[PDB]
Structures are given as structure tokens and as C-alpha cells.
Design a protein around this nucleic acid. Structure first.
Ligand code: MG
Ligand code: MG
Ligand code: MG
Ligand code: MG
Ligand code: MG
Ligand code: MG
Ligand code: MG
Ligand code: MG
Ligand code: MG
Ligand code: MG
Ligand code: MG
Ligand code: MG
Ligand code: MG
Ligand code: MG
Ligand code: MG
Ligand code: MG
Ligand code: MG
Ligand code: MG
Ligand code: MG
Ligand code: MG
Ligand code: MG
Ligand code: MG
Ligand code: MG
Ligand code: MG
Ligand code: MG
Ligand code: MG
Ligand code: MG
Ligand code: MG
Ligand code: MG
Ligand code: MG
Ligand code: MG
Ligand code: MG
Ligand code: MG
Ligand code: MG
Lengths: 134, 244, 84, 46, 204
RNA sequence: ACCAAAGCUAGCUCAACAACAAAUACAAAAAUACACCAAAAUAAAAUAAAACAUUCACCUAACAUUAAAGUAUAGGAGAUAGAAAUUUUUAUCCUGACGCUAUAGAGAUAGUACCGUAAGGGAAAGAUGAAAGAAUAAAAGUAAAAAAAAGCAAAGAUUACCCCUUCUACCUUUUGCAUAAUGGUUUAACCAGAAAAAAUCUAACAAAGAGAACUUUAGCUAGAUACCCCGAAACCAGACGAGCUACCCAUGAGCAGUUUAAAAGAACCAACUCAUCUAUGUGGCAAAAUAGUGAGAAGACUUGUAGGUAGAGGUGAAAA
RNA sequence: UCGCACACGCUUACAUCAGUAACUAAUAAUAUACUGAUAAUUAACAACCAAUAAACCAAAACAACACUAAAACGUUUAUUAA
């Protein structure tokens, strides 16, 4: 859980518990080609690997074999009219790999299923305002 | 813009608000009024009026004390109310010569002092003047009880005073544990100086020590709301049982 | 509509604790759709949803925070939860 | 020979000379912070 | 909601395209004087019938669409009107729309339902403690215009999808006011037994 | 016809009255292991004295206000500095403005851009309308509209633009300037004379006059008349600087070949280090370079990372 | 014909698709350097990563052995180390 204080651990303490978890996940379509066994999650910055594993397994009942994480740096370079910098937020990315031989594929989320006036001026009129009949 | 109250009175209105308001009155009263320190370095002239030599007319003559400096070590010893005199001097004493910055330091000695009331031998840095006053007051403990706050100038002297004054007002049996006779003797001749108990413990303090002691005397960890609610409910039930 | 506090005061502890995850999962699903819609260069369907699932969670918090903060007064009498 | 390149960037030297801790260790450093707060600077210390 | 210190409200929503075009990120314009009307002194609402006392179109009656309180404007539907095209492409100008021009509140009086006349509305608190609008001139109670809501969802015609909670369940009171916190409650309910306790910890 | 030009507001002056939560001193914004804490010594000089040494108000404190009084006194008895005894003071209420409008008024739309290693410095700007959920042509500079023997550029004039005739730009500075002395491309906006002792002038009341204290042999009381702007090199206090360079202290790293019993402050000659000599370059490619040519090249050698010494000082194989 | 890596240092300037009338390039073409939208570098390398007692005079130099200017760097035993 994010932004909370954690109890200081010493020898023989109660197993740490969090009843209402504070994190939130995004499942994102991979920007590059990756094997069928890999899924990709942007997570919040303060989340550890072990956390993402347990979070995935217990909330969603996913059998995860492997997790890896990196931190993405958002550009500092775009400037305001005041010429002060806009910073896009930094964000953590995790790669998970499924244990039971399961293949994922990113669902196409947009199936495409949905639910002639010519007033052009007369070439032979020579600019005469046609509405007027005579 | 301006300030609603001048700044010299900022330092004063500091006391009129907050925790200072809860300090005991006697402490405050003692702090406010400052009896003017006995002249040490400069030499006073008794008469309020003088006769001008050249002018031949009576002149209203006043006394301005010379600013002296107390180093941090002095606060640890008994220097007799003196310290460093910072100033300038004229070489040769002709006003026409060079003016030059100069500092006169007092002469320090390492000596031991004996307390009847504290029953101890202390190693204190003293001045000649300290031993003179210790002499003229006829006792070390006499010297400490017979002297005002401004004249000692030392945290050590005033905590000495506070310590032995407390020991006097408590009538402590620990003084001379095996000899009631020496207790009688020692306590008797200082019996001129006995102060009550609530006054004695506040006498040597500094504003920080006062604030801290007061803080500690005022510490109460907040009553559980359960308590007060139970009290209120019981009050209501008893009023309801009595009205019927 | 998103959950209003008054509707939440009536639930017991276990029910709030459960509601928390029904809220959580919905929030993740919305978040994913968000990003995906941004990638496909297509406007995102019914954005209102994301506003709603926030409020309820935000609401749910308010409700539990009270039940802690009331109870800790009734027990100890220290108003603030962390020492300071 | 040719001059004006005098500043050779180092992150360790930068934080060690002008960083918040170095300021706070000495009284005058503290007053650097103080004056800089009184003028209300976006950045107090390197 | 995004607002700058000096801002002009152009009938356009604060967060909209027409608005970012109207007053781009770097504009600061002249102050707009707004005759102060406190919220409690404000006698107009959206949807009520009003009479326009001012302009080319006056003495007429109309319904109020919305009130913009910042610059103090009322909107009469299709009454005060100026013409604005919608579609404009290179060879074609399409959809000439009559558009509502905003009206100041000094030019608009509230109409009492019965005899259909303009009046000065004044707030009264009744004996029962309701806040009603009484006409000074006609001496009547003037209603306030019960009106739809922005989302267009009418509560009377509504159906639950899969994720909509049925009224009965949501209203049900399951709360049992006992002195535990969520942690001890859930832990006791789930049957998770914990034995060992925290060692002593110092706080600085 | 372009470039431009115009608004009245944002706000200022002066004066009365009196979003949590987490994270933070590790190299701040990093939950978490053995310590230490913490400290204090007169303000100086610039400047006045037409130099400068004693001396030089204000600069800390509160004490206010009307007087005693610029008096007693203190002073290279110079410049200047300067009391007290003793006296005076009716309440609050009653806020505003012969204060500024975007080169003004705050530095401010900002302590932000940006400039500095760092202490620190520090800007510029906005303008239609009820509604944009409706689309005056007036500065310099130019264009419409190259220029025809000749001459401080104009003036007298003429039918007539020239052609004739008559004339040493302007300030400042000097004995004297067309001077080949200084200054300025041009336009706009900003940009420099403040005091009331004595005096004169106009009035009040007069042996008296002033709404308290004073002055009075026509005087007193009141008004009105007055004395600039920009520039050093310096000197003093406190900060910040050894990421350049000077020298050290740690901890690393290079030096091929060829010659010689040899790593010998030896030869030859690369990498690497210096900077001899010439030519280019001189608002450069470069606020010290490039091309050739040169010295040294297992040593008092070059070089990386990280510490240290700070201006009354440091460091120095002394070139101040 | 100053090539590929790492260290230090820079911070998205990198990648894909799209647009370039005008802004960046000291010109154009088109785009690693302009504008918008979207993505992205995944740890075995690298950083972080114990104390206290005791024995041990004996250089690196292809290291036999030496030279003078006297040389950076740890093993092993014991006691405890989540
Ligand atoms: Mg990780
Ligand atoms: Mg990693
Ligand atoms: Mg520079
Ligand atoms: Mg002089
Ligand atoms: Mg002079
Ligand atoms: Mg001189
Ligand atoms: Mg002076
Ligand atoms: Mg300004
Ligand atoms: Mg910088
Ligand atoms: Mg013109
Ligand atoms: Mg002529
Ligand atoms: Mg002449
Ligand atoms: Mg001139
Ligand atoms: Mg001359
Ligand atoms: Mg000449
Ligand atoms: Mg000349
Ligand atoms: Mg000259
Ligand atoms: Mg010139
Ligand atoms: Mg006069
Ligand atoms: Mg006369
Ligand atoms: Mg001098
Ligand atoms: Mg001089
Ligand atoms: Mg250093
Ligand atoms: Mg160095
Ligand atoms: Mg060799
Ligand atoms: Mg040699
Ligand atoms: Mg040649
Ligand atoms: Mg050679
Ligand atoms: Mg040679
Ligand atoms: Mg040297
Ligand atoms: Mg010499
Ligand atoms: Mg010389
Ligand atoms: Mg790197
Ligand atoms: Mg270009």
C-alpha cells in the first residue's frame, strides 16, 4: 500500500497485512514485439516486484512465473508560454510472464461497429444570383 | 505601514501570552525589577550635586555605569560580579596622542570553597574581589545568601543559592545525617534567610529552565473521551432517578 | 451514481472491505481502457465512469477514516493518528 | 592556453560544495539559506 | 477546473475548445465590472418564465436555459437572437442557426404564473421555514422552475445494467455498531489467527 | 499603402484603524542501528576638518509632544558636538487622497526566464465587442514618385523648380573655433535649483504684539519671495569562491619500438606532454587558434577521480 | 580516413507515425537537431552490500634473485553475525 506508514520490523513481529490495497494498475499494449508469455503493466512508482506478483495473483488469480521492472523517464523539455518547463511524469513499467504455459494477446478494443449537398454556382450563369427567378 | 506596538515592548508582551502566563507570580516579579548592580570597575561619587570648578555653579551630577563584558567561563565561576572591561585608551594619556583599542582582563585564581549548608568543597575560579566579599560577609554560604542576583552574575552562584536555600526550607535530615547537634547549629545561624518551599525551587532558574519546569509540571496526557462520556451519562441517570 | 457517504454508513465492516475490491477492479479496467483509447487515437467511451469510481473510493475512505478516528478518540483521546 | 572552459561538471563536487547539507553545517551557510528565503528563491540550495 | 486570475467568460465552458481559442493560455484582458449580487440575494434560476424589458425585443416572455453567475448573465431560449453559421467549408456555408445572445439581469424580470406579469421577487421565510419567493407588486408566492439535470438521466425512467446496484440492497442497513476497527473485524471474520506481538518501538 | 498609432484596467504608493497523506538536514524531499553534542571577544571606514594624525552628528536604545535652548557646557577651545533642573499636551470615535496609470506606480504578470561554480544579479510584456455558442491612417523608416552643370542647401525673389545675388552648421569650451577642438544617425517616452537667520514686499494689531513659554526705544505676528543632475581610482565590514590555475594529501592509470651489460634526471624516434620560429588569422573557426617547424619523451614524467589551504590571506624551482 | 565501447558529464535531444506556409539548420532539398501524437532502456554486468581478538621482518619489475628511492593491494585460526 502506497503513502502509508509501515510498522518498523523487528524480530518476531506480526506478519505485515494490508486490508485495503492502495495501488492501481494499467494493462498496456506492448510498444514492441514480445513473446506470447509476456504482459506489460505500468504500476505506481512505489510498488516493489514482490508486490506486483502478489497483487496479480490474489486480486486476479493469475499464475505468474516471472516479473521484471524498469523506470521510464518523462521528458523535461517542453516549454510553457512563460518559458517554464512542463515535466511529463516518470513512471514504472513491469513485465510479467505466465507460468502454466498460458498465452496472452492484447484484445482489439475497437471493433468498428456503429449504430451530399451540391449548391455549387452555375458556370453559365456568369455570377448571376440564381435565387432571383426574374 | 507600522507596528501596532513598539518592539522593545514585543519582548515584554512575549511574557503576557501563552505558557509564561501560567508561571508563578513571584518568579515574574523577581525577574522584572532589576536592582542596579554594585559598582565594580567604575567609581561612583555619592553626591547628587557638585560644584563646577570653572563655572562656580551647582551642577546636577549623575552616574553612568561602565559597560563590562562577561565571558562564558565567568558564568561557570564566581568572579565577584566583575569581568572584562573593553574600551579604548589614549597612549600617554594626552588627548592629543593616538587612540587605541584595549581590553582589561580581571585576574583569575583557582581556589576551594567550603559550604556548611551544602556540606562540600568546591573548586571554583575566583577573583580577588570574590575572596574579599566572601571575607566581608564572614561565610561562603553567608556570601551566597546575603547577595542579590545582579551582584553574583553567575549561573553557578544562583544555582548554588537555589540548592542550599531549598536545603534550608526542606529542613533536610541528609545534611549531617549522624549529628542533630551540628544540624541545629548549622541551620540556626542561617535561619534569618529561610524562604517558603514553593519559592525556593524557583529562585535560581533561567527563563528556559522555568519554561521547561513549568512544561513538566503541566503535563497531562488527554483524558479518553470514554471517561467524560460515562461521567455525563451517569449524571443524566442520577438526575433522572432523583426527579422521579 | 457513485456511492454517497450516507449509503456507505449503513454497511458493516466486511461489506465495506468487500466493496473496496469491486471498486478496485472496476478502476483498473477503466484505467486500461483509458490508456488504450489514448494509444488508438480514439476518444474514450463514457469518461464519466472514471470520475464516478474515483468518488466512491474516495467516499469509502472517508467512511472508514471516521470509524478509526472516532474510535481512537473514544479509546485514547489523542486526536491525531501519528505521534507528533 | 584558451580559456572559458573553466567549469568541468562534476555531480559529486557540486553537491559537496553547494549542497543543502554543506549549507546547514555552518552558521553563515544557514544565513545564506535565510537570505535566500527572504528573497523567496525557487531554488535555495544546489 | 482550470482558471487564471484574469479571465473572461465567453458563453463557452471553461474547459473547452471554443474557450481555449477565445482566450488562449497567455491572455490577460481588461477587468469586467460585475455589480455584486450575493448568492442569497440572487432571485433568478434556469427554466423559469421571464419578461425582457430591454432592447429590440422587449415586453416578450421566455424560458431561461442557464444562468452564468460570474459575469451575471441569463439565457432566454430563442428570444434575443443573432445569426451564426455552423458548417463552413471552402465551397459551402452550411446550417445558419439563430443563436441566443446573452442578457443582463437588469433587463429581465421574473414572471408570476397566474396573471403572467413581470415582478420584483423578494425572498420570504414562511412560518414552516421554507424559502419562498414573494412578489412585491402582485403579492403572490412565485415557484422556482423545477428543471431537468445536466446528464439527461431521469430517475423515473431507468434500468439497471449488470454493474448497477438495485435500490433494495444499497439501502439495506448491515451496520453493527461495535467497538472494533476494520482490521480486527475483517481478521476475525476471515478466521486469520495471529499470536506473536510487536516489540517495543521508539518515536522521534 | 506598409511599418506603426490610440484606449483603461491589472495592480501599486502613502496613511489611518487594529487541501491532506507520505517524504524530508545520505549528495534536503531516500521508512529503519551506537551517540555525542554544542560555542562565544566594542562595529569599522568612506567622509567633514578645503591636507591630515585628537576629534566628525545620524547609524542601539528608546521615547514621545510644547518649552527651557542651540542656552550650560564639550571641543587640534578648530571643524563641529550638546544636556538637565523645571514646565506643556482631552476621550474615543470620523477615514482617506490638489497619490501613480503598463518606460509610471512595487523589481514584480516573477524573485520567474535568463546570467553567475557560488554568495549574488535580475528582465520583458496586457488592450475590439452586450455577445467571437456573432467577423485614427497623424513619429522616424520606406513605398506611390531614381537622378541632370553650382557648392552649410537656405534666403531675396521671380511668369518660372533650378539658373542669378547674399550669407563661414549648432552646442560646449576658450584670449580667439567654419575649424582639421568636444558632442550628437534619426524618431518617441522619460531625464537636472530644494532650505526662510538677516532682509525686501503685502496685510493684522500697536507701546505693545503673538491661540503658553518669546521678542519689544515702532515693534511684533502672518503670508510671499532661496541655494541642481551624471561620473572615478579608492577605503571599511561581512559573506561566497581551490570543478580554472599554485602547491600539497589520498587513491588509480600510462610510456610502443630502436640502441646499449643498463629505466643511466644516457642516445634515436612514435603515443603523450610542452610552446621555439615563421606565415596565416585580428568583430578570427578561436575573448590566444590553425598550418608547417620545433624541444622532452622511465622521469624534478605526464594524467584521471576525490580531499585540503581564502584576500590584513593562500600558494610561489620569485615571473610582485 | 580520431573507429567501436566504458568512466565522468549531459538529460528525451534517442524510437515510430504524421506535418512542415512560418519558426531550428547560419542557405535549400528533408529531418538525428524544428512541431504534434504515440511509444521506450527488462539483470547474470554495475551500485548498495560485517565486526572484534590473534599469528605473520622479508617489494613490484615474465621474478630465479637482486637494486635503492625501500615499495599499493590479505589469508588462516578463535568468538558472535537476523
Ligand atoms: Mg523494481
Ligand atoms: Mg533493473
Ligand atoms: Mg563563463
Ligand atoms: Mg578631509
Ligand atoms: Mg570639499
Ligand atoms: Mg588627500
Ligand atoms: Mg563614525
Ligand atoms: Mg513596470
Ligand atoms: Mg545555473
Ligand atoms: Mg511618415
Ligand atoms: Mg546656386
Ligand atoms: Mg571666424
Ligand atoms: Mg558638447
Ligand atoms: Mg586654447
Ligand atoms: Mg585648425
Ligand atoms: Mg582631438
Ligand atoms: Mg578637450
Ligand atoms: Mg562623433
Ligand atoms: Mg525671517
Ligand atoms: Mg516697519
Ligand atoms: Mg584614512
Ligand atoms: Mg583620503
Ligand atoms: Mg577542494
Ligand atoms: Mg583541485
Ligand atoms: Mg621505452
Ligand atoms: Mg633520456
Ligand atoms: Mg611550408
Ligand atoms: Mg627529440
Ligand atoms: Mg637531447
Ligand atoms: Mg612549479
Ligand atoms: Mg626578480
Ligand atoms: Mg619587477
Ligand atoms: Mg553514464
Ligand atoms: Mg530555415
Amino acid at each position: 500500500a502506497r503513502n502509508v506508514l509501515y510498522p518498523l520490523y523487528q524480530l518476531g513481529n506480526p506478519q505485515l497485512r494490508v486490508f485495503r490495497t492502495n495501488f492501481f494498475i494499467q494493462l498496456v499494449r506492448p510498444g514492441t514485439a514480445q513473446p506470447e508469455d509476456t504482459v506489460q503493466f505500468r504500476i505506481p512508482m512505489e510498488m516493489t516486484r514482490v508486490d506486483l506478483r502478489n497483487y496479480l495473483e490474489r486480486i486476479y488469480n493469475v499464475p505468474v512465473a516471472a516479473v521484471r521492472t524498469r523506470v521510464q523517464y518523462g521528458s523535461n523539455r517542453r516549454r510553457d508560454h512563460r518559458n517554464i518547463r512542463i515535466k511529463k511524469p516518470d513512471y514504472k513499467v513491469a513485465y510479467v510472464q505466465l507460468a502454466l504455459g498460458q498465452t496472452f494477446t492484447f484484445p482489439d478494443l475497437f471493433p468498428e461497429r456503429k449504430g451530399r449537398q451540391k449548391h455549387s454556382p452555375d458556370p453559365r450563369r456568369g455570377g448571376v444570383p440564381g435565387w432571383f427567378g426574374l | 505601514p507600522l507596528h501596532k506596538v513598539p518592539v522593545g515592548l514585543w519582548k515584554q508582551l512575549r511574557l503576557w501570552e501563552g505558557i509564561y502566563s501560567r508561571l508563578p507570580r513571584h518568579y515574574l516579579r523577581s525577574l522584572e525589577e532589576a536592582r542596579t548592580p554594585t559598582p565594580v570597575h567604575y567609581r561612583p561619587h555619592g553626591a547628587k550635586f557638585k560644584i563646577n570648578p570653572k563655572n562656580w555653579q551647582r551642577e546636577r551630577v549623575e552616574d553612568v555605569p561602565i559597560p563590562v563584558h562577561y565571558p562564558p567561563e565567568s558564568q561557570l565561576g564566581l568572579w565577584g560580579g566583575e569581568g572584562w572591561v573593553l574600551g579604548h585608551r589614549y597612549v600617554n594619556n594626552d588627548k592629543l596622542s593616538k587612540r587605541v583599542r584595549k581590553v582589561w582582563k580581571p585576574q583569575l585564581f583557582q581556589r576551594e570553597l567550603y559550604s556548611e549548608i551544602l556540606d562540600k568543597r568546591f573548586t571554583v575560579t575566583v577573583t580577588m574581589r570574590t575572596l574579599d566579599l566572601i571575607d566581608q560577609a564572614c561565610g561562603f554560604d553567608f556570601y551566597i545568601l546575603k547577595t542579590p542576583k545582579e551582584d553574583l552574575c553567575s549561573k553557578f552562584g544562583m544555582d548554588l543559592k537555589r540548592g542550599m536555600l531549598l536545603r534550608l526550607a526542606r529542613q533536610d535530615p541528609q545534611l549531617h545525617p549522624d549529628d542533630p547537634a551540628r544540624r541545629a547549629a548549622i541551620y540556626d545561624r542561617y535561619k534569618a534567610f529561610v524562604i517558603p518551599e514553593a519559592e525556593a525551587e524557583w529562585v535560581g532558574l533561567t527563563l528556559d529552565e522555568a519554561v521547561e519546569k513549568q512544561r513538566l509540571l503541566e503535563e497531562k496526557d488527554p483524558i479518553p473521551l470514554f471517561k467524560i462520556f460515562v461521567e455525563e451519562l451517569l449524571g443524566q441517570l442520577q438526575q433522572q432517578a432523583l426527579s422521579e | 451514481a457513485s456511492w454517497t457517504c450516507q449509503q456507505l454508513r449503513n454497511k458493516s465492516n466486511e461489506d465495506l472491505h468487500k466493496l473496496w475490491y469491486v471498486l478496485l477492479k472496476e478502476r483498473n479496467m477503466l484505467l486500461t481502457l483509458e490508456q488504450e483509447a489514448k494509444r488508438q487515437r480514439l476518444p474514450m467511451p463514457s469518461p464519466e465512469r472514471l470520475e464516478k469510481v474515483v468518488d466512491s473510493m474516495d467516499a469509502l475512505d472517508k467512511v472508514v477514516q471516521e470509524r478509526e478516528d472516532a474510535l481512537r478518540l473514544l479509546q485514547t483521546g489523542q486526536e491525531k493518528a501519528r505521534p507528533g | 592556453k584558451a580559456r572559458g572552459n573553466e567549469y568541468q561538471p562534476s555531480n559529486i563536487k557540486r553537491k559537496h560544495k553547494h549542497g543543502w547539507v554543506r549549507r546547514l553545517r555552518t552558521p553563515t551557510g544557514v544565513q545564506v539559506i535565510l537570505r535566500r528565503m527572504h528573497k523567496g528563491r525557487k531554488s535555495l540550495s544546489h | 477546473v482550470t482558471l487564471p486570475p484574469n479571465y473572461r467568460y465567453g458563453m463557452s465552458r471553461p474547459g473547452s475548445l471554443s474557450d481555449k481559442r477565445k482566450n488562449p493560455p497567455g491572455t490577460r484582458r481588461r477587468r469586467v465590472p460585475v455589480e455584486p449580487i450575493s448568492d442569497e440575494d440572487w432571485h433568478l434560476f434556469c427554466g423559469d418564465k421571464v419578461e425582457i424589458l430591454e432592447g429590440k425585443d422587449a415586453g416578450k416572455q421566455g424560458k431561461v436555459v442557464q444562468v452564468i453567475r460570474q459575469r451575471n448573465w441569463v439565457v432566454v431560449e430563442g428570444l434575443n437572437t443573432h445569426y451564426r453559421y455552423v458548417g463552413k467549408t471552402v465551397d459551402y456555408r452550411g446550417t445558419m442557426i439563430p443563436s441566443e445572445a446573452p442578457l443582463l439581469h437588469n433587463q429581465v424580470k421574473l414572471v408570476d404564473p397566474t396573471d403572467r406579469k413581470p415582478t420584483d421577487v423578494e425572498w420570504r421565510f414562511t412560518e414552516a421555514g421554507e424559502r419562498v419567493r414573494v412578489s412585491t407588486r402582485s403579492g403572490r408566492i412565485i415557484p422556482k422552475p423545477e428543471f431537468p439535470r445536466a446528464d439527461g438521466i431521469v430517475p423515473e425512467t431507468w434500468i439497471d445494467g449488470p454493474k448497477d446496484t438495485s435500490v433494495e440492497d444499497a439501502l439495506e442497513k448491515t451496520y453493527v455498531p461495535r467497538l472494533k476497527t476494520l482490521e480486527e473485524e475483517v481478521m476475525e471474520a476471515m478466521g486469520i489467527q495471529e499470536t506473536r506481538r510487536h516489540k517495543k518501538v521508539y518515536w522521534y
